[PDB]
Structures are given as C-alpha cells and as structure tokens.
Design a binder for these strands. Structure first.
Ligand code: DTP
Ligand code: CA
Length: 430
DNA sequence: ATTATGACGCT
DNA sequence: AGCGTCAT
C-alpha cells in the first residue's frame, strides 16, 4: 500500500556503443563504413577469430567467436579489420583509448560507472531535478526525443518501424503530468531528453553511435538498452514491468544468464521473470541464499538498489595470452620468453596509467592454465609489485609459478601451459 | 583452437 | 588469500 516501495527513486541510464570495435576501425578506414565487416584477431588459424560484427554482416548470420573462414561462407563479401599485434600478442590499446574518448564525454553530463570497455551507467537523478527546474511545468516536445522508444507502447484501440516509434512516444507524452516534479514517469522522460543530448555529443565529437536504456535502476536500464539496437534509446517505466517481464526469459536479466539463472528455472519450474512474483521472499532466499533471494524478490517487481558507482577508470590492468593445442608452452625458455612479452606490454600500460591517472599498482597477480584443465584458470598467485620494470615483473612471475612444473628436467615444462596472465592490482594514489 | 579482457562474490 | 561466476 502506502508503505510499499516501488523502486522509482532514481533515474539511471546505460549507454552501450554499437558494435564498438567495428566502429573504431570504420572511423579510421572509411572503406569499411556501411559495409558488412568484422574485427578479427590473429589470421593464421582459420582466418582469425571474430570479436566484433557490423549490423550489415549480422544480417548474413555472422557472429562473434566465429572463425573468419567460416564467416566468409555465410558472407563472401565480408570485410575484415585485424586487431593490432605487438610482442606476439593481440594488443587492444586502440579500443581502450577510443573508450576513454567516450567515457570523458559522458562524464561531462554526470558521474559514470565504467561497466566495460564500451558500456557506462549514469545516475541522472540530480541532473533531471535541475533540468525540471528550467522547464517549469513546460511540456516536453517529442522533438526532444528523436530516437527514443517507450517500451510497451503503442497499445490499445502504420506498418512501418519509425511510425510505430512515434505513435508510442505520442501516447506516452499525451499521458504525462508535467505538473508534478516528483512524478517518476516525468523524471524518466527528462532523463531520456538528457541521454539524447549525451548520445548526440558522443556522435558529434567521436563519430561513434550508441544505444541507451533509461529506467529506475541498472538492471532495467541495461535490459532497456538492448530492446532497440542499434542507434536508438529505450525508456522502460515502472509501469511497463509486469507486461515486459511476463514473457521475458529469466536468462535475459543481468546476472541470471548463467548457472544461477538455470537453477532458478530448474528448481522453481518457471521460464519467465514475471513468474517469480508468486514466491515469497523467504521461499526465494531458501533456494538461492539470503542475498540472491532478496535481490530476486525485488527484481522481478522491477526493483533494484545497486548504486551507480563513481568509477571511470578500470580497477585492474591485465595482459593475457592463450596457447591452444600444439602451441602449448613446453620449455622453460618458452615460459620465460612469453612472461617477458606480457610483462613488457604491462609495463608500458602501467607507466601510461601512472602518468595519466596519478596512481600506482602495488600487487602483481600471476595466473596460468595447464593443459587438460577445463577451468579457464588453473592457478593464481600474487607477489609484490614495487617497480614498473618488465624484466623484474616477469622474473617475479616465474618465481611464483616455477614450482608448478612437474618435469624432473629443469629445462622442460610439464604439463604444458595453455595460458599466461599478468594483472596489476591494488592501486594507491601517487 | 576462441581470445582478451574486467568486476565482484565466497570462504 | 585463492577460486568461482558472470559479463563485454
Ligand atoms: N567475448 C569477447 N571477446 C573479445 N572481445 C569481446 C568479447 N565480447 C565483446 N568484445 C569486445 C568487442 C566489442 O566490440 C566490444 C563490446 O562488446 P559488446 O557490447 O558485447 O558487443 P558490440 O559492441 O560489438 O555489439 P552491440 O552493438 O551488440 O553492443 O568488446
Ligand atoms: Ca556494445
């Protein structure tokens, strides 16, 4: 009733760059623009592995993880851009720097939480309040929402996509009460106005297009973002939740895409998020734990309280390389040489980070995978990171893992290593 | 023979 | 600490 929380206290957005690495390469090489194209890493093995795909290529069925040779079978005219290779490994610097471009623009509008290389959450609550004070009861023109979809609309008593968009937007605005400055629906709408502005600035100043979700929390914002890709934004109101969730597979919600989501489905014998409303909070806690149970109880009602964390920079800086099948490292000289290569890229990135961001990493994490292990990581050890020196870091990394060697022979390494990973962590101000 | 990342929860 | 899960 009057004490039942509705989770409408915040305005939160999720900005998601469209086929990001592809856009980066297309900006650099105009020949790739408006073409079926993909970004690949390495080229020797089956033409290389695809890590990003343009929407033109997706129409042919091209997907991430697909080998370029196989993608060509579906899309013979597919164009390709290769990830830069340095010191024998893929180097993602161009995309990290492009990410910084976008993140710094978004930061002008509000505090952001860097979710990934090309996603950021935004808490627009305060900005919306300010903007509402300028409007002063003034209605919101549909012209201020040129790329916005209102989920669930149109509805009630045109066969084209854009036509439908406008009809929904019209119904939404027609029902708004611009008279109430505390109206959640109004707040969401102003949030979307600001996101239009943010997305316009991103495209103007970088050339990159993106999609966005606007709602009352991170999970709904994220879900909304994916509803109308690419180059569009979607508003998901609290009111839209029941119908939206009624046919929404549980795996579509952030954090429920893996084993937990599978267990929710199996244990409860349900398929859709909405079906969760029929269980008490205690019931959910009993199956999935105190934390998960509470989260699920609230989430299926469109309520979540995870805050947009003020963090624009990554917490860690890591370098990793796989050594599949026959290429698995089997000698001591091999292991040492590749640790050095990884350590050299790491030193380079750490030094840049220290100059730009006034901080120093204090811990070096070393991870390896042994041939046969199904897990991505077989072992993880840490040592002190006291100096940004590649030779020292590689030596220290070898030291902490050198006893993983079974070979009675000092020169041979067994079982062969199929993955090396160096990660700098635990930053302090400098 | 996907690969290269990155954040956070559990114990 | 070291491992697992989930995500771009
Ligand atoms: N599994 C992966 N391995 C390596 N790189 C990845 C992987 N997933 C994503 N990336 C990289 C390439 C992507 O361009 C970028 C952002 O990923 P993601 O948001 O999942 O898709 P995308 O931006 O390419 O397409 P979309 O338009 O659907 O968002 O990060
Ligand atoms: Ca993206």
């Amino acid at each position: 009733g009057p004490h039942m929380a509705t989770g409408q206290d915040r305005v939160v957005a999720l900005v998601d760059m469209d086929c990001f690495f592809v856009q980066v390469e297309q900006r650099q090489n105009p020949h790739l623009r408006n073409k079926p194209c993909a970004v690949v890493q390495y080229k020797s093995w089956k033409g290389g592995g695809i890590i990003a795909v343009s929407y033109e290529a997706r129409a042919f069925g091209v997907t991430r993880s697909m080998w370029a040779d196989d993608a060509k079978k579906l899309c013979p005219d597919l164009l390709l851009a290769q990830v830069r290779e340095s010191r024998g490994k893929a180097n993602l610097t161009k995309y990290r720097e492009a990410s910084v471009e976008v993140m710094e623009i978004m930061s002008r509008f509000a505090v952001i939480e860097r979710a990934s290389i090309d996603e950021a959450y935004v808490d627009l609550t305060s900005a919306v309040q300010e903007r509402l004070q300028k409007l002063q009861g003034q209605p919101i023109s549909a012209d201020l929402l040129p790329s916005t979809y209102i989920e669930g609309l149109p509805q009630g008593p045109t066969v084209q996509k854009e036509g439908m968009r406008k009809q929904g937007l019209f119904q939404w605005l027609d029902s708004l009460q611009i008279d109430n400055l505390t109206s959640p629906d109004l707040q969401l709408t102003v949030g979307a106005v600001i996101v239009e502005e943010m997305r316009a600035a991103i495209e103007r100043e970088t050339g990159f297009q993106c999609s966005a979700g606007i709602s009352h929390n991170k999970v709904l914002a994220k879900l909304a973002c994916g509803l109308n890709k690419p180059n569009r934004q979607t508003l998901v109101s609290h009111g839209s939740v029941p119908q939206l969730f009624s046919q929404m597979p549980i795996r579509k919600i952030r954090s429920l895409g893996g084993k937990l989501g599978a267990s929710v489905i199996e244990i409860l014998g349900i398929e859709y998020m909405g079906e969760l409303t029929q269980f008490t909070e205690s019931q959910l806690q009993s199956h999935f734990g105190e934390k998960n149970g509470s989260w699920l109880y609230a989430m299926c009602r469109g309520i979540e309280h995870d805050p947009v964390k003020p963090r624009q920079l990554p917490k860690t800086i890591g370098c990793s390389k796989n050594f599949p099948g026959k290429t698995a490292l089997a000698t001591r000289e091999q292991v040492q040489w590749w640790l050095l290569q990884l350590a050299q890229e790491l030193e380079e990135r750490l030094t840049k980070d220290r100059n730009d961001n006034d901080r120093v990493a204090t811990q070096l994490v070393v991870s390896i995978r042994v041939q046969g292990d199904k897990r991505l990581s077989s072992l993880r050890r840490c040592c002190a990171l006291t100096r940004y020196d590649a030779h020292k870091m590689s030596h220290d990394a070898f030291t902490v893992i050198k006893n993983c060697n079974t070979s009675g022979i000092q020169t041979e390494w067994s079982p062969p290593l199929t993955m090396l990973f160096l990660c700098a962590t635990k930053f302090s101000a400098s």
